[PDB]
Design a protein around this nucleic acid. Sequence first.
RNA 1: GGUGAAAUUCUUGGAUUUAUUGAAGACUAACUACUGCGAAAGCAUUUGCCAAGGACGUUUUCAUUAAUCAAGAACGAAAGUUAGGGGAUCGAAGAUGAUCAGAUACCGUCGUAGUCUUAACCAUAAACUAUGCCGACUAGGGAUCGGGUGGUGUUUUUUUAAUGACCCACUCGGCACCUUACGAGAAAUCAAAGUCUUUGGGUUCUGGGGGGAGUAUGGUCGCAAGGCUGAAACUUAAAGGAAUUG
RNA 2: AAAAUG
Lengths: 97, 212, 97, 25, 127, 202, 91
Amino acid sequence: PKKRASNGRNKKGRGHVKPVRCVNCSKSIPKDKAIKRMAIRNIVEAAAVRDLSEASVYPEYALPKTYNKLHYCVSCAIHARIVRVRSREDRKNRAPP
Amino acid sequence: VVDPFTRKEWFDIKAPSTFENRNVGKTLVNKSTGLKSASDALKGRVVEVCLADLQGSEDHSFRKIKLRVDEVQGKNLLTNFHGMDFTTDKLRSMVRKWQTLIEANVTVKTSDDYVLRIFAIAFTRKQANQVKRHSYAQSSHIRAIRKVISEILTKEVQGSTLAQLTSKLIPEVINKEIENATKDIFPLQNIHVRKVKLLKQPKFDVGALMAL
Amino acid sequence: SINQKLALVIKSGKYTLGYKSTVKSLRQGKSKLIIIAANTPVLRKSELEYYAMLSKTKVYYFQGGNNELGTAVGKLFRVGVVSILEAGDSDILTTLA
Amino acid sequence: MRAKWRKKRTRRLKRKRRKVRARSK
Amino acid sequence: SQVFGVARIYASFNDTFVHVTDLSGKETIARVTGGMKVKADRDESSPYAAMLAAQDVAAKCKEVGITAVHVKIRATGGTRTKTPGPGGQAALRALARSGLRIGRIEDVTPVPSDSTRKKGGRRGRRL
Amino acid sequence: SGRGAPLAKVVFRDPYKYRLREEIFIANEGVHTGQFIYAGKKASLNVGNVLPLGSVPEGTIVSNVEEKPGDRGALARASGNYVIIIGHNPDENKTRVRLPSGAKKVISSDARGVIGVIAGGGRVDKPLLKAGRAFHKYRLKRNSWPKTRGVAMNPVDHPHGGGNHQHIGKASTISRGAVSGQKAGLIAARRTGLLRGSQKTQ
Amino acid sequence: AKRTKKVGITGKYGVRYGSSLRRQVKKLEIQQHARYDCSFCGKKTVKRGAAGIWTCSCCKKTVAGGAYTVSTAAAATVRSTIRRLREMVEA
RNA sequence: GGUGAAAUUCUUGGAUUUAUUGAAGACUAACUACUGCGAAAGCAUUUGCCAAGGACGUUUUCAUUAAUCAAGAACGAAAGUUAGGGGAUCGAAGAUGAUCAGAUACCGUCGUAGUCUUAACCAUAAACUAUGCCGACUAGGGAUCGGGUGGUGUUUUUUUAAUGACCCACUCGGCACCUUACGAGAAAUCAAAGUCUUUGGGUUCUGGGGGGAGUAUGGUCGCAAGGCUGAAACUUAAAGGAAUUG
RNA sequence: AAAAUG
Ligand SMILES: [K+]
Ligand SMILES: [K+]
Ligand SMILES: [K+]
Ligand SMILES: [K+]
Ligand SMILES: [Mg+2]
Ligand SMILES: [Mg+2]
Ligand SMILES: [Mg+2]
Ligand SMILES: [Mg+2]
Ligand SMILES: [Mg+2]
Ligand SMILES: [Mg+2]
Ligand SMILES: [Mg+2]
Ligand SMILES: [Mg+2]
Ligand SMILES: [Mg+2]
Ligand SMILES: [Mg+2]
Ligand SMILES: [Mg+2]
Ligand SMILES: [Mg+2]
Ligand SMILES: [Mg+2]
Ligand SMILES: [Mg+2]
Ligand SMILES: [Mg+2]
Ligand SMILES: [Mg+2]
Ligand SMILES: [Mg+2]
Ligand SMILES: [Mg+2]
Ligand SMILES: [Mg+2]
Ligand SMILES: [Mg+2]
Ligand SMILES: [Zn+2]
Ligand SMILES: [Zn+2]
């Protein structure tokens, strides 16, 4: 039967969506279907913010951040637990945690 | 059995006549020899230093500046403007979802001879009372804004030399002029001249270089 | 456009088609405007320009060739030059330049 | 077997049949 | 009051490069890697190997005359990972406490404008 | 006769004597009779005009290009062929160009070329379809046709001659240092077999 | 009546030289024997002389062109890029 | 370097790494969305030109010109074919390193055709919403895209105003969504898959247990690969759909 | 990392 009411993707009124490559295994997946996660991680968290601040030549440096949009295919996202198998009723919940 | 740092000498990078600070740091090169001139090994080096370090103010922490060595003058490498680029962290922080990213780029010649490509970026923004959550432009606003920015950049270049273009870039007056000329199209929060790329240099003009 | 005015002139006004009748109308001074196709030979175009200068007749340069000018004047044959003798109820003689 | 590979095997066999029928006359 | 170099930590997976250069980058000072500091062929990217490489690099930088470093850290970039390897942060911390002063940390990972189709095929690496 | 490309008879005035000088150019595609051809340093960038290589911008398509200034045309003369201006070096004035063979050549910036592509292109796309048509093609070029295979000869006639089967017998790739009578086959071949992949290595 | 199903102009060659070669030759023979529009007098009276020569029966003007077409795509592209370079150089 | 671990491989002829350049082809990140356009396939850098299109607005125009459609046409992803150009990347085949019991598989390194383009062929996809098209009606709700109307509206300056952006209210058209389903359905689920034994708005196509079989044959299209059309003998009590508990 | 058959 049909598992997901719309589909396992987000494509209504389109027909075709250009694919992206999974960051983990490089599988081709349509962009609307791929699981997309943003990473805003500090350039140095590393249990090392204070060490880099002390070593810094600038007072109040405000070290920058790395921004990375990760695209995961379904299999890789499930395996790496970015996304988990949910119950039939819990699947109908698009709110992030 | 070399230890090549015994045959190396240090030189001081004197970047500007205009930035705020002549001293940016030091660079090392092999001592001049018979068939290998240290002045020839230098004079093509590009150093990328932060505009915050060039100006003394952390309000220029983005906008890295490229400085190309033109002459070696008695243990002093006199450089000149070679290009400007935003930092990757600043660019990524500015680029956000639920808004329109507008980019323009022009290839313009400075008043004397310098060919440059200017890349300006801007982002649509919500109004103070806006309830809508994305504030997208209608791509005709985007075309008009791009045309306005292209005209602004092409007239801000072609009316100044490279030195005056750098002195205009430092206070970011071009961003304010773009904001003033586009505020009647779309709010356009994060206006920036994100990059200047040097494409073709004039004849050397050591006299023009000798302003520092 | 030029085509609607030309069609109106053909429908209501008076005209001559072709180089010989155009030159005759120019020399008798009953030509109000001459339309010269883009592909007219340059010597003939220069002679028409000289005739129109002598007769104080306006010259409009049709962007199409003789085929296009014939189509614009509504004929199934090539027309290298048109001469407007009377505009009829058409504003071609004033809606130029 | 898989339907796709069954169709592929059938196509290969059809090519063989066409070839033998062509060789005959 | 300090002599500035550039750290140039290339933290890929399978390796970490700690490559201190001059301000220009043409002249290099004490490029040391994790594979130089471990002999196991699988811990080349390890944080311990990166820390050892950064400590050696900073020692040679202080012996040469480099006191501070502007930090430029990159992943493989291009189309391969885009994520810094496990050794980059460890190398940066080792440089931070090896007496070197730190300035202007930046991520310089090469990012395309959707060029150069990624390796692996359309079904990707199947493990 | 013997040329794929048509020729243009361009008549100029003699600047030093009252007379006409007819010149035989290789017609570029688009050149017509009654057209004015302009030749010189100050001639405009128009098809059929003869311009120095330095006076044309990057990407210009020229033909009948001089190898040295004044040689009156050496390169890109066969039908459909052309030279691409790919760069200039004003100091030590030179022009970098792409030849029809794909080679990159540095030529003096004073060397002249004809703007456009040599007329008669696409000629070799039509199969000759007939030994008679090949016969008539080479009847007005030279006695190089038909060609007997050396493997079909006797040993006295060719290195490939002889044997109880028609076969080469030794490697047909012949050294550049071979002498006359030995250079039959693939002279100084860097490689053999079907070309697979991309050519023009770096 | 349509006299041949597919060979057309190449029916002169009978069954010789192969179907693929006959089609390749047919395309270019049709191209080379077609009448073309004159860009000077506006008539469809341009026919090939020898290869690369295209003469209008009316107005007697002859132009250099392709071996089997009045204008090859390469020559059209060359004309367009030459116009572009000339306009850029003049402005 | 690569991997889970390795090895193939490159490397003191200086590999990898760093800087400065140049060339080539491809692609168009981030912005990018339960967002837009298109008949569908599809379409994402700027600018110019060329024609085209929906919706909206209309106290314009014609006046039934329409809906759906055997036959017939146009387009039709990818792969593949032909012939030029191009050939950076990845990469059917192929070669190799490993793993293995074997591993001409997964994994690693290369690498031909291909990938790109022009001129033509091919006409097929889980070409999918597995839901023909046109029309009417039957719940509740909030968003959003395009157009329009209004406001004692907010913000922006040009000198009155004004558009621009935003807010509020409505409206037409659209991609959708949420709740509940009176109703439907075997159920999953469905605002259509409802208005069906209280069975008829119009119309096109298709199916009739599972195999044999989309096979054989014939025809037709195609350069070929193949496309379209398409049985029978024989065999069989199940195959299948949805859901439940293990 | 490997894990086939009843
Ligand atoms: K490793
Ligand atoms: K022979
Ligand atoms: K022999
Ligand atoms: K290739
Ligand atoms: Mg299932
Ligand atoms: Mg599809
Ligand atoms: Mg798996
Ligand atoms: Mg396995
Ligand atoms: Mg031969
Ligand atoms: Mg014999
Ligand atoms: Mg012999
Ligand atoms: Mg021999
Ligand atoms: Mg014999
Ligand atoms: Mg290694
Ligand atoms: Mg949009
Ligand atoms: Mg983009
Ligand atoms: Mg039909
Ligand atoms: Mg295709
Ligand atoms: Mg490869
Ligand atoms: Mg089908
Ligand atoms: Mg179907
Ligand atoms: Mg049945
Ligand atoms: Mg079931
Ligand atoms: Mg059993
Ligand atoms: Zn994956
Ligand atoms: Zn003519």
